[PDB]
Amino acid sequence: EAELRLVKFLPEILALQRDLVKQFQNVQQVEYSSIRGFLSKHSSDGLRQLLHNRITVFLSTWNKLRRSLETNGEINLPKDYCSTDLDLDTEFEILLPRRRGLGLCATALVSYLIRLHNEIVYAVEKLSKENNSYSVDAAEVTEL
């Protein structure tokens, strides 16, 4: 329950991924490794505040789970990524859910959250004996 209560933050961070994947028209590289600098170069202060709330939520839910992610994940994350308490001044590549590199952290977290939810739902699947395949994909995920 200590780490299962963090599934409620799953949609927001998911939006943080999408509102980056759409927003990032590929410039072929990552800019200077600082989220705070990214917000500094961001144009509008309102979207700056929105992105700031989103990164704070993401970093809070990542720091509390990185030690867990070091061993409970299903993908071999190198031990150095899950070693320090990342903050808003860390490398910006974390936010992008790249399948290889620093981004493999964020994706991993999302995966765990999915595996955190369905698994306990799996228990319900072992109780009612009638499966409702209401399997929404990871772009329609909401508070429901």
Partner: peptide, 9 residues
Amino acid sequence: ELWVQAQYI
């Protein structure tokens, strides 16, 4: 984005 500007302003 216009709504966000008006909301935070």
